Design a protein around this ligand. Structure first.
Ligand SMILES: COc1cccc2[nH]c(C(=O)N[C@@H](CC(C)C)C(=O)N[C@@H](C[C@@H]3CCNC3=O)C(=O)COP(=O)(O)O)cc12
Ligand SMILES: COc1cccc2[nH]c(C(=O)N[C@@H](CC(C)C)C(=O)N[C@@H](C[C@@H]3CCNC3=O)C(=O)COP(=O)(O)O)cc12
Lengths: 299, 299
């Protein structure tokens, strides 16, 4: 019964709008009297090679932006730029605005994406911020402005806004203060992601889940120090494990009676010898987007 | 990128309530002026072993039901049993009632589940009705009354309400008329489902999904007959393929350009020789919980 789950999306659906600037349309996020969207909405295809966004913006007026919340048209009172985001002040304050916060997600953590097209929600799914600051998403044309989030209690933490697809098929975007994750820039360019690495904390959580499921062929009685495990991990493009990660795994360690460093010695052997066709939780590939929190929450 | 995706759950979240009867609480679905929930809310531990629900319900009155829609308590005006569901009439009609229908879904079809606890939505995910009429869901204690659904245009098709977990960890429940899917009954007894099989139609749709987005490595130049493929299907516990199924795969066959019986030959090879450590859509197993409809909508 281990599956990826998304947070319920209703609180975010109530904030999704459409923003149109001439020929280009995309999604924006309506909280109180401000609408947030990618700033490349003001761009033409010609402007996309090397845009001067401050120039492009001064040449726009409030009336240049068509903002539609479903049926209603909203009147843009003012506009400003915040990093790679446009902030549109609007006539009307969103009655559906939830309690919210803007957070910067860290590599390895997960969030739900509400994929939207023309301001209309289309689907929800879970994904993770990769170590190389991309996300392996599902985005078609028209998805820019779609938002990633977590929900704790009744408060929505917005963490991601979609901007771009890279030639490798992965996706890039910003936090809700308009700062890109990673070295990417909002212009058509030859940019490519760094070498991705595997989220070791999450592979270890997945192995604990596999043991909880009654799968423990990979266990052994070797010992490893944290330092010696980290040296092998990096050879195989796995992220090194920090002290904090070891403590994050404490609850799963106690539930299974497998010491964290002993699970690390199990993983070290999988890296060095491969699986030899055997499966773990049905797969020959080590899953790395299930967090320790996901495992404990589903037991 | 190709992921399992759930419908946005906003329209369903507005319908979720909490129903308590003595010391037992679960989720209910509030549409217009009636609340639907599993009838075993009226049960105790001793009753759950072999209950007579007609007897237990004649002994209750409207006062015996506390229905909470967030902060507000709704007053129960009437009550009746419909198969394995209770129907509670309440004085207030739900203003957030969407356009909706009750549908009984067929084996092989998919839907989203809004997993709820104490009337509070907790997560959303996609799953399928298995050929043996169970679902492989993620349901913890307190999730009874959680609902499965699809959305088309603005209309919510409710198809599932959650009732129980089988010893194997799969889940069983009813349609919104209260009739169980499968051979199960709502008593605290150990119950077996029939032997499951793989949903062939869905594996084929997913192979088309792989061709549309990305890899064709598993394709070959051969062909098979419907009858000769089904001979391979039975040996591997796959559902036999019919002509109607082939008619369904028409549009996917046209967009990709691979005839349906050619894709069957590719599948027969994958079953006979395994995947030799290769991956098809980031997966090392043949995924069978995407319908043809799901693939087209996501492309
Ligand atoms: C030379 O240029 C390229 C070369 C090779 C690969 C490339 N990839 C991207 C990109 O990733 N994204 C943006 C614009 C870039 C130029 C800033 C886009 O082009 N379309 C989508 C998002 C995309 C669409 C499919 N999946 C997505 O994530 C929007 O949502 C907003 O753009 P639209 O208003 O719909 O045109 C540009 C690019
Ligand atoms: C000894 O008998 C058994 C043997 C072997 C397997 C068994 N399985 C069940 C079962 O599932 N029983 C229903 C109660 C009815 C059908 C009689 C139930 O327990 N449902 C849970 C949700 C479940 C809990 C964990 N995952 C879920 O899906 C509630 O949430 C409501 O119960 P509570 O309100 O929490 O007390 C009984 C049983």
């Amino acid at each position: 019964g281990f599956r990826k789950m998304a947070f319920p999306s209703g609180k975010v659906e109530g904030c999704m709008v459409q923003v149109t600037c001439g020929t280009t349309t995309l999604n924006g996020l309506w909280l109180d009297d401000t609408v947030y969207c990618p700033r490349h909405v003001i761009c033409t295809a010609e402007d996309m090679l090397n845009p001067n966004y401050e120039d492009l913006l001064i040449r726009k007026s409030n009336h240049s932006f068509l903002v539609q919340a479903g049926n209603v048209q909203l009147r843009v009172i003012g506009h400003s730029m915040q990093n790679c985001l446009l902030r549109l002040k609007v006539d009307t304050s969103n009655p559906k605005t939830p309690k919210y916060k803007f957070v910067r997600i860290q590599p390895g953590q997960t969030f739900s994406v509400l994929a939207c097209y023309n301001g209309s929600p289309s689907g929800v799914y879970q994904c993770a911020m990769r170590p190389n600051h991309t996300i392996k998403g599902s985005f078609l044309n028209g998805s820019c402005g779609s938002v990633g989030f977590n929900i704790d209690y009744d408060c929505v933490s917005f963490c991601y806004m979609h901007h771009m697809e890279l030639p490798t098929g992965v996706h890039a975007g910003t936090d809700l203060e308009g700062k890109f994750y990673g070295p990417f820039v909002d212009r058509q360019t030859a940019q490519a992601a760094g070498t991705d690495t595997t989220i070791t904390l999450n592979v270890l959580a997945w192995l604990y889940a596999a043991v909880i499921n009654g799968d423990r062929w990979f266990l052994n009685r070797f010992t490893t120090t944290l330092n010696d495990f980290n040296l092998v991990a990096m050879k195989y493009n796995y992220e090194p494990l920090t002290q904090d990660h070891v403590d994050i795994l404490g609850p799963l360690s106690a539930q299974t009676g497998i010491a964290v460093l002993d699970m690390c010695a199990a993983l070290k052997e999988l890296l060095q010898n491969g699986m030899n066709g055997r499966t773990i939780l049905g797969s020959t590939i080590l899953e790395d987007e299930f967090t320790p929190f996901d495992v404990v929450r589903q037991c």
